[PDB]
Amino acid sequence: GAFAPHFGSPFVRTSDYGKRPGLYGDFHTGIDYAAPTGTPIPAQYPGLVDWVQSSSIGLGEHVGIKVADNLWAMYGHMSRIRAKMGDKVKAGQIVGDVGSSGWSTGPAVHYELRKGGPNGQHVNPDTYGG
Ligand SMILES: [Zn+2]
């Protein structure tokens, strides 16, 4: 996983990427890490902030960071966004605060890997890149 997420404490992984338990029903498009609302989200990989959105839908408050030539890391369900568009960010820079914005049951951060663009196709962060 060349761009797998490596959140430390207090982030705890809850729902994996891909088809959920059983053979029918839902498909998680990223990896959910649980943590209290307000927990600062440190960026996993350096890149350019080229996508910021506030909505009450799906990922809700989220940022996209271009972390590779054709790969964008998305950090979602924020309670507060702290990156501005154009920001060059380093790994471990705090890009936001955990929330439950959008379509999330409780407090967690949704890490999604997209190819083709900030609204592009999602991939498996655990496996993409090796
Ligand atoms: Zn999710």
DSSP letter at 117 equals S
The answer to the question of whether 6 is labelled as a binding residue is no
Backbone angles phi and psi of 109, in degrees to 5: -120, 135
Long-range pairs for 61-68: beta carbons < 8 A, 24 or more residues apart: 61/96, 61/99, 61/101, 61/102, 62/101, 62/102, 62/110, 63/95, 63/96, 64/114, 64/118, 65/89, 65/95, 66/118, 67/3, 68/3
- Enumerate residues with CB within 5 Å of ligand 1 (an ion): 32, 110
Spatial distance between the Cα atoms of 40 and 33, rounded to a whole number of angstroms: 12
Is beta strand 12-15 parallel, antiparallel or unpaired with respect to 78-81? unpaired
Maximum alpha-carbon separation in the chain: 41
57 CB-near residues (< 8 Å, 6+ apart): 102, 103
Compute, in angstroms, the gap from residue 128 CA to the centroid of ligand 1: 18
Spatial distance between the Cα atoms of 95 and 105, rounded to a whole number of angstroms: 21
**Cα 41 → chain centroid:** 9
Compute, in angstroms, the gap from residue 77 CA to the centroid of ligand 1: 8
b (16+ CB within 10 A) / e for 28-57? ebbbbbbbebebebbbbbebebebbbeeee
49 CB-near residues (< 8 Å, 6+ apart): 63, 64, 65, 83, 84, 85, 86, 87, 88, 89, 95
Compute, in angstroms, the gap from residue 84 CA to the centroid of ligand 1: 23
Structure tokens of 64?
């996209």
The answer to the question of whether 77 is labelled as a binding residue is no
Nearest to 17 by CA among 81, 74, 95, 99: 74
